Every structure is written in structure tokens, then in C-alpha cells.
Amino acid sequence: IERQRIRLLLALLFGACGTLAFSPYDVWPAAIISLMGLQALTFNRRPLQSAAIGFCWGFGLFGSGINWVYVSIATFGGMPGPVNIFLVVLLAAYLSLYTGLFAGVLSRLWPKTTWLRVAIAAPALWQVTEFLRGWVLTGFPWLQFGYSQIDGPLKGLAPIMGVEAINFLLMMVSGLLALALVKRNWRPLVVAVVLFALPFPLRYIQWFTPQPEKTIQVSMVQGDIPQSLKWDEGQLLNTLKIYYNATAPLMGKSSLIIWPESAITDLEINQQPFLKALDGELRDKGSSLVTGIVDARLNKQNRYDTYNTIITLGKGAPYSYESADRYNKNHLVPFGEFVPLESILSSFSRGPYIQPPLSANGIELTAAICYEIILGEQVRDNFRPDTDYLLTISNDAWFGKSIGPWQHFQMARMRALELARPLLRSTNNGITAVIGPQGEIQAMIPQFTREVLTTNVTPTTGLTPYARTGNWPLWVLTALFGFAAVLMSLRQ
Numbered sequence: 001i002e003r004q005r006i007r008l009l010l011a012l013l014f015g016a017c018g019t020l021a022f023s024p025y026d027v028w029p030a031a032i033i034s035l036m037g038l039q040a041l042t043f044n045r046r047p048l049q050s051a052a053i054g055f056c057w058g059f060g061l062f063g064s065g066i067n068w069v070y071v072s073i074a075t076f077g078g079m080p081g082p083v084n085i086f087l088v089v090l091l092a093a094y095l096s097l098y099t100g101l102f103a104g105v106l107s108r109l110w111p112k113t114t115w116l117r118v119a120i121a122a123p124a125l126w127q128v129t130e131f132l133r134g135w136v137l138t139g140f141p142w143l144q145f146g147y148s149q150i151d152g153p154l155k156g157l158a159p160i161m162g163v164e165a166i167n168f169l170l171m172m173v174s175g176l177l178a179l180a181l182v183k184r185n186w187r188p189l190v191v192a193v194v195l196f197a198l199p200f201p202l203r204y205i206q207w208f209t210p211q212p213e214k215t216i217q218v219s220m221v222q223g224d225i226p227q228s229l230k231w232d233e234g235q236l237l238n239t240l241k242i243y244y245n246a247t248a249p250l251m252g253k254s255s256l257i258i259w260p261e262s263a264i265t266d267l268e269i270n271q272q273p274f275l276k277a278l279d280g281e282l283r284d285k286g287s288s289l290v291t292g293i294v295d296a297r298l299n300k301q302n303r304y305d306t307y308n309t310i311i312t313l314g315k316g317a318p319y320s321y322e323s324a325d326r327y328n329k330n331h332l333v334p335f336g337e338f339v340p341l342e343s344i345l346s347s348f349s350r351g352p353y354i355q356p357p358l359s360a361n362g363i364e365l366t367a368a369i370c371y372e373i374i375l376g377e378q379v380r381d382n383f384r385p386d387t388d389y390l391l392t393i394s395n396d397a398w399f400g401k402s403i404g405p406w407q408h409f410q411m412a413r414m415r416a417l418e419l420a421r422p423l424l425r426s427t428n429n430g431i432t433a434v435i436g437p438q439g440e441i442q443a444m445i446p447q448f449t450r451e452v453l454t455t456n457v458t459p460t461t462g463l464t465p466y467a468r469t470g471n472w473p474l475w476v477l478t479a480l481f482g483f484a485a486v487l488m489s490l491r492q
């Protein structure tokens, strides 16, 4: 009943089981079953056989939860049908090389099924595997099972140690469950249930203190403009008319107005009179505007540097082309925004890794453009104690009518819970919502519409343990399990 081909096919099923645990489905027990399969199917196999089981397990997970990038390739790349499919398969195969490396190293150094393998060696080795997947070649740390516990019992662990710590606990509990199920021993099962029920009383603790006196009315415009690679005439006039006519009635009623990523589809240097006239009108009616735009700035080398920029206008933030109250994108998308090859004979420019928060009407907002919100370590480093709200703008017009924007929206909720700060997410047509300090959704408008999300938000001024330390304590605990497990395997 173990021809390994059965384990290869079962790894495909247990791998795709994890996709059913994210935002479009919200079934967090699917993560435990997905990890138990990867933990169990790697028992008593060759280092190369276990590596193939891990590679096949990762191929089923990424083949189901990442395939939504095909339409993104079927829109920007222009390649034929079969070529776009091969690029998605090669992406899923590359992302599966890390999970196969995890099961390969776990079997080469721990061939036997011991409680140290599944509860000590597996979680420690899993943190190093997922790190390399989300760091190598400007990594893609997508589909992390810690993002599923945003609404579950283990939510109280994120503000203490981070989302990557929940990934450490899920592998430890599922390892004990897979061990207790094969050996038919009730002892690891009880330890697993205990270690899983312990983090529950942590969700009823609030490291933040809301300030109802500083409650303000915020508005976020959802433009829902059609996508066209060609910059035509009139498209800018129609886009500017749509965003203004939805913003003009808000002035004098909402203090903070937010436009999504690259709302002004023109260069910043070309819309100087449009921004000057809009800044002066906002200052008169007592309001501010935070909008995304593309900035083509001249370097002192007399060269042009293109940035994916966030600019501020209005009261408390007078607009100026040389103002430092802006935000430039740091970590860029590998293919869509730059070219990985340095010399081959259109590329954007990266911003600073740490940028000061945006100030509008005295409100501090640490910005993160689109993909940057899923990087919990970088967001915490940019985070500051005086930050009132977390700001995230994105253009999820790509991969529409898919599970992509939901997985992206779910990872953004974790940043609010990690830092105990409200999240302001404004999109062109994606998931425009307001997330509370505990990851709770306070407001949300539907997708694919041209509406305006207007609600009231209250700032907090807490300091979670993760905000002070970050993933730094997790690597300490990871090194302790790693050194103890390797020394135990080398204790021969």
C-alpha cells in the first residue's frame, strides 16, 4: 500500500488541500490536514524519495493557489497560450524545489520517525525553507499557512512573535498529529491538542489603546478604470474627471481621502498645475488627499529615475515636487516592474528600505504599495510608534475574478494584527476595506464597482511585542531547535 507513486499522488492531494484554507474559502483546518500529509508521507523513505514527495506536495499547493498569475502573464507578456502555461508550471516547479529540499534534508538527517523529528526538527527546518523561498531572487513568500489563522484561535500569537511564528506552531502540531496517527499513540495527540489550545487565551488581550477623541472620517475612492498598456489621449482626462468628481463632494466632510495605486496615470512632472490647484482647494475646505502616481525625476547625473510614488496634498501637507512627505516603492515585482538581467546588450527604480511615515492632517501613515504589504518584516521596520494607521494602495486589476486578490487581502489583515494599528486599503477595483487593530474588518465595499468607501476610523497608540522585536526572537528559538536536532542526529 506504499509504492511511493501512491505517496506522490497523495502529496498532490494533500498539497492542494492547503489552498482551501485561505481567504476565498476560510477553512483553517485544511492547513493541518495539508501539513499532516506532508509530515506523514515523508516517513520511512529515501532522502531522494522524500524530496520527490515534498516536491510533489509543493507542486499541488502552488499549482492551485498561484495559477491566478496566468492571466497576469496572459496580459503583460503577450506570449502565446502554451507559452504562458509553461511559465506558470515552471514557477510552480521552482517554488516546489524548496519544499522538496525540506523533505530531502529532513529525511537525510532524520530518517526515522521520532518525536524530535516532527516537533523539533521539522518546524525549525521549515522556517529556513520558507525563508529561502521568500528571499532568494527577490523572493515570493506567498501561501503561508499562518495567514489562515487571522480569524482562528491562534490569532493572539501574531502580535507577540509574528505570522511566521504561527507557521512554526502549525508544523509542530501537525507533526505531532501525524506521529500520533501512524504510531497509534495517544500521547503526542494530547500534547498536540495542548500546544494548540494554549495560544487561544491570547486573542482576548489588547496591546493597543484606541483614542476615540482622534476619530476622523476617511474616504477611499475605487476608480475601476479599464486597463490599457497604451497611454492614449482622453484616457487621462476621463480618469482625472472620475477621481475628482468622486472626491469633490467629500471635501469638507472627510478629512482624509485616499486614491489607489497609480491613480493619476500621468507623470507627476506633467500634472503640476493639476496638483497645485487640487492642493489649494483641499487646504481651504480642510482636508487632505493621499494618491498614488508615477514620478519621473531627474537625477543629479542628468538621468531619469522612475518611481511608483505616493504623494500627499491638502491641509497639513502642502504639495511640492521637492517635498519629502512622499513614499517610493522599495521591493519591486521581478518581471512586471524591472528586468532581472543587468546587461543584455524598461526598468523602474527602488526606493529606500526605510521611509518616514506620511503626514496628512497630523496623521501618521506608514505606506506599503501593493505587494509590499505581505512582507511583515519590512512593514515592521518602517513602522513607528507614532503611526496612526497602516496605509496600503494596490491595483489588483490584474488577475481579476480569481483567488489572487483575496489571498493578497488576507495577508494585509495580518499586518494590522501584528502592529495593533488600523489598516486603510484602497484599490482600483480589488478589496477596498478598512481593517481594525485586531484584524477585524470594519468596512468593505464590493469589487468591480465604481463606489467610494467612506467610514470612521479610530487610531491606536500601542506597542505589540512583535513591534519591538520582530521575527528576531523566532530565529533564536529556531536556532535552539535546529542546534538541538542536528546535535541529536550527530549524536552517533
Ligand SMILES: CCCCCCCC/C=C\CCCCCCCC(=O)OC[C@H](O)CO
Binding pocket: 380, 381, 382, 383, 384, 385, 467, 468
Ligand atoms: C535593542 C534594540 C534597539 C533597536 C533600536 C530601537 C530604535 C527604536 C526605538 C524605539 C521604538 C521601538 C519600536 C520601533 C519599531 C521600529 C523601529 C526598529 O525596529 O528599528 C530597527 C532597528 O534599529 C534595526 O533594524
